[PDB]
Design a protein around this ligand. Structure first.
Ligand SMILES: *[C@@H]1O[C@H](CO)[C@@H](O)[C@H](O)[C@H]1NC(C)=O
Ligand SMILES: *[C@@H]1O[C@H](CO)[C@@H](O)[C@H](O)[C@H]1NC(C)=O
Lengths: 281, 9, 276, 98
């Protein structure tokens, strides 16, 4: 059975580029392409693609559910079984929906979060896609209530594979593979179980047009610190003389603050939160 | 008896 | 005597040729007893030895859940490795893990393991004290910091001292007639002449279990440590193993040479001498 | 990336005797990475229905596999064909009943 794949991604903007490859008999050999609704009717009047089909610029005509068959000369039919299916979804065909996380984007390891996609546009389906993932976007039917259509995607139990940058999309009836422009991205972070750091303030949590800097430090070797106000900031950690690793976030000229440690090359997983600290103005 | 392998690199 | 349980897993990315593949296998001593293969149709841990086949359904549900969890963790670790080593997403890479434990004759814990390789090279390993980690390069040094910040060695220590040893002891009893057996080698010698002045003496050992064995050649007493062609011990396919050792001898001197066979199945080690 | 070419051993499960049912084994070991193509050949032709063990590896992380099939030997030349990334051409090892 040939292995079909889209590169770099099956979710692709109109005007972008995507390559369909058909790997069969240790070769990306000669192959023909088929779409759903065409079944055993080869697309492009039976074009026998040679190496890999570069669709560029991508148009809405490239959207579809594709399978390939590869050349098999010493065979009865001369060709191979149909490959696995690859769904090319073309984005940028409607105005973007909105994406928000309930209760919020910071998710304790093992827990759950709802990513709600919604729009004033009446989308029949919504898709949720984590950036850089080859998995099929998750698909749900749009529910209609009070001038908006929406869909609640349940994410969890939370872990590193589910953290990252998410976008959601809408599509309308009869063109399901033609997706909207992506929603504004939402970063979903898994917190724990790394050891929570400590939060402190300079000169202190009591200020009245005065400036304050909040220090987040730890014995664990965090490379990054993240300061969160209940009502988002990022800074590299510096090796201090206790061998501790600190970062100083200047705030001034209040709020309840927590901070989280983070490691190099791992931007979506943070420590347990520090204990809350209240800056009172 | 398998081990729970849950911590990523 | 002493015994061991090992789980070995291999994770392979193969962009454009297949989805990432995860294969795990469980052994007691030299005897495989389970497998899981992410590409196979069952998506279950499967028995690969008769004596585990009578484990109840809850065992297979529990083991399947854990090995699938491992599959997901190491397939994410492939992605992480690309970032740590600044490698491109087009290449194929290999991520291997081994964990398990040894027990002595008394069934008490002797050693535990929990270690990883990336592209055929040591990556990170749990130390003998089961409390600290050996990181083999700067990328694994990141993992070490994370794992220290998470205190994860505690969970490894708890598994190795309790669950792993408890399972090994249980399996040793389940498969006693096959795991605690000791099949001796059947031996013989072949002779082949190289020239008018040399010949090859090959000492053969077949049908033995476990796979541990010593074949050695001596000439008048001093063993030919660096003149003996040794072949890696190979599986016969029925649960026994085979090995041979050969030495090159001046024709007419075959009587000076003796092959020595040491194996736990032998009451007394064998001293074999070729004769026409 | 480290790369290790496979050692190859072609042999019979039991002492070969003409007319007697047996198993032909090709054991590949010490190789890395794990993708390998192994064929048992009979008079140069590929034998079907060949089974193989589950991928495993040794203490040095190098992989090993056993390929095997049922066969009745005859006065018919058997071999093993191994392809690997470390080999530009396939390696053929004949079975020697000697
Ligand atoms: C794509 O086509 C396959 C049949 O080839 C079908 O099973 C699959 O559900 C289709 N996917 C979608 C999203 O239509
Ligand atoms: C979707 O999730 C939101 C936030 O948790 C909730 O208020 C709403 O009732 C959910 N909608 C449906 C249809 O379940």
């Amino acid at each position: 059975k040939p292995f079909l794949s889209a590169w770099p991604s099956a979710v692709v903007p109109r005007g972008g580029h995507v390559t369909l490859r058909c790997h069969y008999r240790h070769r990306f050999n000669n192959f023909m392409l088929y779409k759903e609704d065409r079944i055993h009717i080869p697309i492009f009047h039976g074009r026998i693609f040679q190496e890999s089909f570069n669709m560029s610029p991508v148009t809405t005509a490239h959207a579809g559910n594709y399978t390939c068959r590869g050349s098999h000369p010493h065979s009865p039919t001369g060709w191979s079984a149909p490959s696995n299916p690859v769904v090319i979804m073309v984005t940028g065909n409607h105005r973007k929906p909105s994406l928000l996380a309930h209760p919020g984007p910071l998710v304790k390891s093992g827990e759950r979060v709802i990513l709600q996609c919604w729009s004033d546009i009446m989308f029949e389906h919504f898709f949720l896609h984590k950036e850089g993932i080859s998995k099929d976007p998750s698909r749900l039917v749009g529910q209609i209530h009070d001038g908006v259509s929406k869909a609640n995607f349940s994410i969890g139990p939370m872990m590193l594979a589910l953290a990252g940058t998410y976008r959601c999309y809408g599509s309308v009836t009869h063109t399901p593979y033609q997706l909207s422009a992506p929603s504004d991205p939402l970063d979903i972070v898994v917190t724990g179980p790394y050891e929570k750091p400590s939060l402190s303030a300079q000169p202190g949590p009591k200020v009245q047009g005065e400036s304050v800097t909040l220090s987040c430090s730890s014995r664990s070797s965090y490379d990054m610190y993240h300061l969160s106000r209940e009502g988002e900031r990022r800074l590299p950690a510096v090796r201090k003389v206790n061998r501790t690793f600190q970062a100083d976030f200047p705030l001034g000229p209040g709020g309840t603050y927590r901070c989280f440690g983070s490691f190099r090359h791992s931007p979506y997983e943070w420590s347990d939160p520090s204990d809350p600290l209240l800056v009172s103005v | 008896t398998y081990q729970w392998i849950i911590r990523n690199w | 005597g002493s015994h061991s349980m090992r789980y070995f897993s291999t994770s392979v990315s193969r962009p454009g040729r297949g989805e990432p593949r995860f294969i795990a296998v469980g052994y007691v001593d030299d005897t495989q007893f389970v497998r899981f293969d992410s590409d196979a149709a069952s998506q279950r841990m499967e028995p690969r030895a008769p004596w585990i086949e009578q484990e109840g359904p809850e065992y297979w549900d529990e083991e399947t859940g854990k090995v699938k969890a491992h599959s997901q963790t190491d397939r994410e670790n492939l992605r992480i490795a690309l970032r740590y080593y600044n490698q491109s997403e087009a290449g194929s890479h290999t991520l291997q893990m081994m964990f398990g434990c040894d027990v002595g004759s008394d069934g008490r814990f002797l050693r535990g393991y929990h270690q990883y390789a990336y592209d055929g090279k040591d990556y990170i390993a749990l130390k003998e004290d089961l409390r600290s980690w050996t990181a083999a390069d700067m990328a694994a040094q990141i993992t070490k910091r994370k794992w220290e910040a998470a205190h994860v060695a505690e969970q490894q220590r708890a598994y190795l001292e309790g669950t792993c040893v408890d399972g090994l002891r249980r399996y040793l009893e389940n498969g006693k007639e096959t795991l605690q057996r000791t099949d001796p080698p059947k031996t013989h010698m072949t002779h082949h002449p190289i020239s008018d002045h040399e010949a090859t003496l090959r000492c053969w050992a077949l049908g033995f279990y476990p796979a541990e064995i010593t074949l050695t050649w001596q000439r008048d007493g001093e063993d030919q440590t660096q003149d003996t062609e040794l072949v890696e011990t190979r599986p016969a396919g029925d649960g026994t193993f085979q090995k041979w050792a050969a030495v090159v001898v001046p024709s007419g001197e075959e009587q000076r040479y003796t092959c020595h066979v040491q194996h736990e199945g032998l009451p007394k080690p064998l001293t074999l001498r070729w004769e026409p | 990336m480290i790369q290790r070419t496979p050692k190859i051993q072609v042999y019979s499960r039991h002492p070969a005797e003409n007319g007697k049912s047996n198993f032909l084994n090709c054991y590949v070991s010490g190789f890395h990475p794990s993708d390998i193509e192994v064929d048992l050949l009979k008079n140069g032709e590929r034998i079907e229905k060949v089974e193989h063990s589950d991928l495993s590896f040794s203490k040095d992380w190098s992989f090993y596999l056993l390929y095997y099939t049922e066969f009745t030997p005859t006065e018919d030349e058997y071999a093993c064909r191994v392809n690997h990334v470390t080999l530009s051409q396939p390696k053929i090892v004949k079975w020697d009943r000697d």
